Design a protein around this ligand. Structure first.
Ligand SMILES: CCOc1cc(Cl)ccc1-n1c(CN2CCNCC2)nc2ccc(F)cc2c1=O
Length: 181
């Protein structure tokens, strides 16, 4: 089931610029000044979707065209927001990412290298709560499976997870965009 995802402003790390529609996010040129509510990611440029999922099946698409790094997927709502962590299946995160413009990996511990034929301009996330799966699909390549976590022992609600980059050092100015449908 198609989910209409929007970004939660309360989770967004200071370094992030959300669109006004809540459907787009880019890494910014310096921190912004906002509060330090407990829901906000202090240590890395991450933000959640507003939707919580307690059950059922949910699909959404993210445009990543041009970007040299990024991280997508799903996480426990109960993940710590304050401080340092890895994006690991062991630690409440079901993610894939592009690092360094060339290296796709999936957030196993330790992570798993992905060899993609067609580099994705667009990525699908499919959450099946009851199955205990999070699946990533390469839309550019007609929906080929990028990677799938299974036997995820979902307890409590989950959130869509996003990060458009780690350091604006490069030109990671382009946004993650949530696609219509
Ligand atoms: C590929 C780069 O990975 C990282 C880079 C930095 Cl600067 C900080 C943390 C990580 N990272 C991370 C988090 N980063 C992943 C890549 N995108 C940025 C966040 N997750 C991991 C999960 C499992 C594992 F075995 C290792 C890692 C890991 O090293």
């Amino acid at each position: 089931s198609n989910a209409h995802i929007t970004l939660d402003p309360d989770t967004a790390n200071p370094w992030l610029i959300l669109s006004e529609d809540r459907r787009q996010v880019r890494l910014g040129d310096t921190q912004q000044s906002i509060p330090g509510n407990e829901e906000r990611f202090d240590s890395y440029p991450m933000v959640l979707g507003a939707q919580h999922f307690h059950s059922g099946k949910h699909y959404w698409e993210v445009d990543v065209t041009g970007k040299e790094a990024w991280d997508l997927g799903v996480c426990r709502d109960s993940v710590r927001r304050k401080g340092h962590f890895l994006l690991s299946s062991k630690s409440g995160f079901w993610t894939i990412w592009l690092w360094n413009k060339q290296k796709y990996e999936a957030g196993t511990y330790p992570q798993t290298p992905l060899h993609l034929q067609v580099p994705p301009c667009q990525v699908g996330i499919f959450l099946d709560y009851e199955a205990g799966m999070v699946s990533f699909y390469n839309i550019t390549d007609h929906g080929s499976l990028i990677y799938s976590f299974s036997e995820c022992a979902f307890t409590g609600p989950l959130r869509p997870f996003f990060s458009p980059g780690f350091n604006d050092g490069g030109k990671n100015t382009a946004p993650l965009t949530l696609c219509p449908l």
